[PDB]
Design a binder for these strands. Structure first.
Ligand code: MG
Lengths: 414, 107, 168, 252, 40, 226, 180
RNA sequence: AAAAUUUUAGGAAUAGUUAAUAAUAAUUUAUAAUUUUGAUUAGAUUGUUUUGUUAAUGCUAUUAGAUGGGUGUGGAAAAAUAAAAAAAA
């Protein structure tokens, strides 16, 4: 945690010729040597104590599993929660490892690479399924579930191992995306919903047509589990206030629109059948249709807001449950006169993660593609007003030099 | 594309951009890496923020706390000076010890 | 103040130029004459681009109605009773300024204000907020009363007595 | 670099929604103070002009998913004091909150009940004002309120206004209904369809005057210590209204 | 400088100023007469 | 700005008045807005002679050894009642002794009637704190016939010096709501017999002979001699 | 606006205040004292290298004898002279356009110069201040009330442009020759 | 916000560093930046025709009195000696 939260203000890690046969300068130790030494020490300590922090598990046969469970209950040295916290901090350090090598680096060049935590993920999943209920409907447990799914996706460990294996026996084999959509708790925030949807998209690399496809060729709801999962993913508590996306930036908006487009494409017959005011006679299906319509409308409204009002106070984001020091300063002060707010000039602009948001180049191109996909196959993209406005915005910004197009954006727009 | 526009002030790069031309010298591997790693780092940061909510939230809160508690948050003349150690070199040594040199660039 | 324009150019650039058609949309309204209610026609004028679809024309009408009596409820556009396909453009239908486009409304369905695009929006993206006048209705060099004229107070070189060189 | 993209003028500021002192709480009487003039102006407009969707047959029906998104800002009138479901009811018995409806009750329609409906999630408040008795103001036959049984003239009609719990007052503010329509009551005497045309006689010349106005009582200067010259103190002529320069009716 | 005549309202305070800015009605009337002459 | 004195006239600094505009000159100090104020020092410096000569008991102390004779307690109560109204009665002190808490009645200051001033506030609601002599009062303001549309807070209500003339007809029960008094020119028709305007926007009272004589003697025109 | 203010020289508002015309004096003995009529801010800008906005003139308090008595003699020619300089265009620009303030000594000096009427403080003890009576003032106004159009034209000429062309000027301006 | 002008008998290395950035509040990328055309540190000294002197584009003077932890107030800190100054009738 110290490594991850280290203040990296004056690091300035670049190759210096004069340091070929020795480390950085004595006065440059804290700047260009401390972080590299710290991460090398982390690597060494992990390689030393990985088998102690996460002991190797052995299922063996049924009797072997019983013996393993008895041993674990006899010696529950570390519980699943703290083991998961350790693994999460290790994964964060591995993702934010030191990448740049120097000629003065006497060690191997392969050292400055992210770690492989497949065994640790397997062990923590074993302990999670060993305990009765690792996940809870609370938002903190939603964050833990998101972190566990992220660990599984990153380290290519199949999911559901955190969950009891009886469900796996019932479903024969469940992919990571299917497990996420089947066991994902209903979120309370649009940010949590965005994280869940991104995990859903990332779990199935190319089998997206098996994890969010619940309809047949005629529009009948085949798999109700996926329907219920999507319904609780797009919850009213997360997308109900008509300002649910007030803290959603361009990347999260792209994630939302991509999720909506994928759902529509995988269930095209169902949507084009039941969008004609035809009653399904199923409260679950009606609720799902209403939730999808609400999500699409609010996502389009957020995209229009960002496109038409850049950097305006209306189109401003802020980190969820963000800390506003002005309110605390006013609360813990002498309220002799309520119009005499203290530290007004500093506190009016001070806020956690509050920044102006406007559509960029990659963001605009991807949003244009996703809005084009959100319509029908026969719908005229030329007639689509938002797509033309996005394209003209990209052209105007490129001509004004406020952004530049890359080959990815060219391939998206052509 | 080798000439700037005196009327509008556009440089030769802007003129070439408007004319659709391309004046880019053959880039070396380090320059290609410089132009290519920005997207990689952005994707890495976005993936980390979407995959580890508690760690990203803690880091952002700590960064905001230090930014808000910083002594020189106000944007006065001294904070708005582009080169503080060079412009206010009278303070160095006697009062401020952060910079050991009063000159870092070609100014 | 960053309006993506840092030089002076009096001429109008080609991208800003747009081709427009002066369409008129007529609604069946009712006024209370001394006897009772009588049918009347209310015409709203719009400037719709030549390459606009019927849906785009409908959106323009909703934006530019500027009255809580015409576009309050949902409606669809037709010509001679035949409903116009919202996915078709004006060119396919042959619609011109002479074409009489009627609007038929459904009282039960109410038209929620889902319009977030400003009416002054254009390619230049120089939109003036809190302006409810359409970009075509008002066009003049109207005097400004919010600001005040400012004269130069700091002299350059000459301060008084004899001019001499002036210290330029 | 990033530091020299723009100067530090006009930084991004926290919205008024987050600030507690900016927003208005429904429990406080300030909510009713803000919403009462809008209600009375709406009733005055509806008593003289047909508002299209201000009167409905039944409460607006929307799916529960879209209810929180669409309901805020809605405002409509119904006959009888029937209240929507899934709404905890709180009658407003506080005189401090009720005083702001005094002018509405006295001059437009006698106000009978004031209720606040809080939803299950406490995110979509409803304000229900039930009025008893016919409209005091004259009602046009083409006016919207002519449809209501209890308005034109049991004899009770309710107004429902949906808002959000903690928002700045601009969210409560309603300005689409600030449309001014004439009242033809003083002109109905001379109308062709009125049988009183041959009664009034036009007084085209002022009568000859033999006396002046009665002289005012002799001015008595004040006795208690005054604060000073209100014109120099920038006080409006009575601390109430007017212009400081045009001083009048202040002890002299 | 704002004049403080002795016949103004006396503030019987030991913790602040001994005379108040409140004036007798005659002072208000006289002040207006002086205001008119400066207006010319 | 909005309301200058004599327009823009900068002959001297005193020609701008004691204040430039009625609205606060700085956005960060709304309390600097121009309004009529009261002699709070004099109205709150109550006479201590009534309290003198009578024993007092602190509210916190309820011990038996600190208790006093009941006759001493009664004279202390009457002395405190005299002391609280020595400099004048409060609006809350007037409302506590009226039926329906004085709702619907007119309250006016001592100086709101003398001269060309004619101002009163029609009470609409009062909220007492645990100290009944203080609180918050909301009412309608009527100034030379014109009456406000909504009830506003009463400025300097806690400061004593108020007068009320209770009328049984104007009393409003707590069940109902206090109706705003009609505008004499707008709501009800204008009637010279019922109400007569003391001063119009361009009216100036004639100079009193005593004031004129005093001014001339001070200037030295009239021969004032010992 | 300060913790410990300058008690020996306070002002009314913040620095730098409105421009004010005043006679800045030197720091010499009385025998060689002279004043400079200059326009500067309300708060003196002695700190910076630019102190005054403009320099209007110089005044010599000590009178000198008439060095031009042998010239064409007029009434009171041989009295002592009080020489002084004053800029007129700059004074009118700052007084009308910029609307600067004015002190009392410069006001008296300009009253002598004829640019401005005698100051407010140039009062004699011969006659006291006037006493105003509303009824008498209204009676005089009713006796002598000017025409609306006449007063409007007078104030238009005094405030707006005074170079209004006549019909003859307009006709002369209008082309009469073959219009090319 | 920029450009030019910038001291020492016995002359050498300097560094919260340069640029790019979807990065306000840089976990990234780079063969980075300063300097013998005199840098950084240390010494002296209030920077841009004002003094003296001479036939002199030489030599010799000079308080333009200017800036991060003491209050985040204020439009703007410069705010705890003074410095000829009129500050709301
Ligand atoms: Mg040097």
């Amino acid at each position: 945690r110290e490594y991850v939260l280290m203040d990296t203000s004056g690091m300035k890690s670049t190759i210096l010729s004069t340091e070929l046969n020795a480390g950085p300068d004595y006065e440059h130790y804290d700047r260009r040597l401390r972080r590299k030494r710290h991460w090398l020490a982390i690597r060494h300590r992990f390689e030393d104590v990985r088998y102690v922090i996460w002991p190797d598990v052995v299922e063996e046969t049924a009797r072997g599993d019983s013996a393993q469970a008895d041993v674990s209950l006899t010696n529950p040295s570390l519980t699943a929660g703290e083991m998961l916290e350790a693994l999460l901090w290790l994964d964060a350090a591995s993702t934010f490892c030191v990448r740049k090598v120097h000629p003065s680096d006497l060690g191997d060049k392969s050292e400055f690479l992210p770690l492989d935590l497949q065994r640790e993920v397997e062990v923590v999943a074993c302990h999670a399924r060993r305990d009765l209920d690792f996940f809870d409907p609370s938002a903190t447990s939603l964050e833990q579930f998101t972190a566990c799914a992220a660990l599984c996706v990153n380290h290519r460990v199949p999911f559901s191992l955190f969950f009891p294996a009886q469900d796996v026996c019932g479903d024969a084999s469940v992919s990571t995306g299917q497990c996420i959509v089947a066991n994902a708790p209903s979120p309370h925030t649009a940010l949590g919903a965005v994280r869940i949807m991104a995990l859903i998209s990332e779990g199935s690399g190319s089998d997206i047509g098996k994890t969010i496809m619940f309809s047949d060729a005629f529009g009948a709801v085949t798999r109700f589990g996926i329907l219920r999962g999507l319904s609780r993913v797009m919850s009213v508590e997360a997308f109900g206030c008509k300002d649910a996306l007030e803290n959603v930036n361009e990347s999260e908006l792209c994630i939302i629109l991509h999720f909506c487009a994928e759902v529509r494409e995988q269930n095209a017959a169902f949507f084009r059948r039941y969008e004609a005011s035809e009653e399904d006679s199923d409260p679950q299906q009606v609720s799902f249709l209403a939730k999808y319509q609400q999500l699409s409308q609010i996502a389009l409204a957020r995209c229009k807001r960002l496109l038409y009002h850049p950097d305006s106070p209306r189109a401003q984001v802020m980190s969820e449950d963000g800390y506003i020091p002005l309110v605390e300063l006013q609360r813990h002060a002498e309220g002799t006169n309520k119009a005499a707010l203290i530290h007004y000039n500093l506190g009016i602009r001070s806020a956690q993660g509050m920044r102006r948001v406007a559509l960029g180049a990659q963001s605009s191109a991807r949003l244009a593609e996703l809005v084009s996909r959100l319509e029908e196959a026969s719908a005229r993209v030329s007639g689509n007003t938002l797509v033309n406005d996005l394209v003209h915005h990209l052209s105007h910004k490129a001509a004004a030099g406020k952004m530049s197009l890359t080959l990815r954006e060219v391939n998206t727009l052509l | 594309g080798l000439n700037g526009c005196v009327e509008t002030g556009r440089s030769r790069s802007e003129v070439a951009r408007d004319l659709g031309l391309s004046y880019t010298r053959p880039l070396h591997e380090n320059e290609k890496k410089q132009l290519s790693h920005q997207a990689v780092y952005y994707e890495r940061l976005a993936k980390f923020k979407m995959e580890q909510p508690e760690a990203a939230r803690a880091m952002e809160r700590e960064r905001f706390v230090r930014k808000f508690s910083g002594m020189f948050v106000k944007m006065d003349i001294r904070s708005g000076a582009p080169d503080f150690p060079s412009t206010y070199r009278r303070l160095l040594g006697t009062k401020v010890v952060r910079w050991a040199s009063k000159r870092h660039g070609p100014n | 103040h960053d309006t993506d324009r840092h030089y002076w150019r009096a001429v109008t650039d080609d991208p800003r130029v747009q081709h427009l058609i002066p369409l008129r949309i007529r609604f069946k309204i009712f006024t209370w004459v001394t006897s009772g209610w009588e049918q009347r026609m209310q015409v709203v004028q719009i400037m719709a681009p030549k390459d606009s679809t019927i849906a785009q024309v409908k959106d323009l009408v909703i934006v530019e109605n500027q009255s809580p009596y015409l576009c309050v409820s949902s409606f669809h556009l037709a010509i001679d009773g035949k409903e116009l396909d919202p996915q078709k453009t004006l060119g396919e239908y042959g619609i011109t300024e002479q074409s009489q486009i009627d609007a038929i409304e459904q009282n039960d369905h109410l038209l929620h204000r889902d319009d977030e695009r400003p009416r002054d929006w254009t390619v230049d993206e120089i939109t003036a907020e809190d302006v409810k006048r359409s970009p075509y209705k008002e066009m003049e060099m109207q005097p400004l009363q919010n600001l005040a004229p400012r004269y130069e107070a700091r002299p350059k070189g000459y301060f008084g007595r004899t001019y001499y060189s002036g210290m330029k | 670099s990033r530091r020299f993209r723009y100067n530090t003028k006009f930084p991004a500021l926290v919205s008024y929604n987050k600030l507690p002192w900016e927003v208005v709480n429904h429990e406080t009487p300030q909510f009713h103070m803000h919403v009462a003039p809008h209600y009375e102006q709406l009733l005055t407009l509806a008593a003289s002009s047909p508002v299209p969707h201000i009167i409905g047959s039944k409460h607006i029906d929307v799916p529960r998913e879209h209810r929180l998104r669409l309901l805020p800002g809605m405002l409509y009138l119904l006959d009888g004091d029937t209240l929507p479901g899934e709404f905890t009811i709180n009658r407003v018995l506080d005189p401090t909150a009720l005083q702001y409806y005094g002018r509405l009750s006295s001059q437009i329609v006698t106000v009978e009940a004031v209720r606040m409906l809080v939803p299950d999630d406490l995110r979509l408040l409803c304000n229900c004002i039930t009025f008893k008795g016919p409209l005091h103001l004259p009602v046009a036959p083409y006016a919207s309120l002519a449809s209501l049984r209890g308005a034109s003239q049991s004899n009770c009609f309710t107004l429902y206004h949906f808002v959000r719990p903690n928002r700045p007052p601009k969210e409560l503010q309603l300005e689409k209904y600030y449309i001014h329509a004439p009242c033809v009551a003083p002109l109905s005497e001379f109308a062709s369809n009125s049988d009183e045309r041959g009664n009034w006689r036009p007084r085209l010349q002022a009568p000859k005057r033999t006396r002046r106005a009665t002289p005012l009582p002799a001015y008595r200067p004040p006795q208690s210590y005054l604060m000073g010259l209100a014109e120099r103190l920038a006080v409006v002529p009575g601390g109430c209204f007017g212009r400081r320069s045009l001083m009048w009716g202040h002890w002299f | 400088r704002q004049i403080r005549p002795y016949y103004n309202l006396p503030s019987k305070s030991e913790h602040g100023r001994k005379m108040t800015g409140f004036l007798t009605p005659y002072r208000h009337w006289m002040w207006k007469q002086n205001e008119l002459w400066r207006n010319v | 700005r909005a309301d200058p004195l004599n327009g823009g006239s900068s002959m001297t600094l005193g020609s701008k008045g004691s204040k430039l505009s009625p609205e606060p000159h700085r956005r960060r100090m709304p309390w600097t807005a121009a309004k009529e104020y009261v002699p709070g020092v004099v109205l709150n410096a109550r006479d201590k002679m009534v309290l003198d000569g009578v024993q007092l008991l602190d509210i916190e102390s309820i011990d038996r050894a600190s208790q006093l004779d009941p006759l001493e307690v009664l004279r202390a109560v009457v002395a405190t009642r005299e002391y609280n109204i020595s400099t004048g009665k409060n609006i809350f002190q007037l409302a506590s002794q009226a039926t329906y808490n004085g709702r619907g009645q007119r309250f006016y200051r001592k100086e709101w009637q003398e001269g060309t001033y004619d101002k009163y506030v029609t009470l609409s609601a009062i909220d007492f704190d645990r100290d009944g002599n203080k609180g918050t009062a909301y009412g309608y303001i009527t100034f030379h016939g014109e009456t406000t549309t909504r009830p506003v807070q009463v400025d300097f209500a806690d400061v004593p010096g108020w007068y009320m003339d209770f009328v049984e007809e104007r009393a409003v029960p707590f069940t109902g709501i206090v109706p705003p008094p009609p505008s004499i020119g707008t709501d009800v028709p204008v009637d010279p017999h019922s109400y007569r305007l003391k001063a119009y926007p361009y009216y100036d009272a004639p100079n009193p002979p005593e004031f004129v004589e005093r001014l001339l003697k001070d200037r030295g025109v009239l021969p004032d001699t010992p | 606006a300060r913790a410990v203010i300058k008690r020996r020289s306070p002002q009314l508002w913040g620095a730098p205040g409105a421009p004010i015309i005043r006679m800045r004096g030197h720091h010499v003995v009385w025998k060689f004292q002279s004043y400079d009529l200059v326009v500067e801010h309300t708060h003196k800008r002695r700190n910076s290298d630019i102190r005054l906005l403009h320099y209007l003139g110089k005044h010599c308090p000590h009178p000198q004898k008439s060095l031009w008595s042998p010239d064409t003699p007029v009434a009171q020619d041989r009295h002592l002279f009080m020489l002084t300089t004053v800029d007129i265009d700059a004074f009118k620009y700052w007084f009308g356009v910029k609307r600067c303030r004015l002190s009392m000594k410069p006001w008296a000096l300009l009253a002598k110069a004829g640019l401005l009427p005698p100051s407010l403080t140039q009062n004699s003890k011969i006659m006291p201040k006037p006493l105003f009576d509303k009824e008498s003032l209204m009676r005089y106004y009713l006796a002598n009330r000017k025409d609306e159009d006449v007063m409007a034209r007078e104030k238009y000429l005094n405030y707006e442009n005074s170079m209004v062309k006549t019909e003859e000027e307009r006709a002369a301006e209008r082309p009469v020759a073959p219009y090319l």
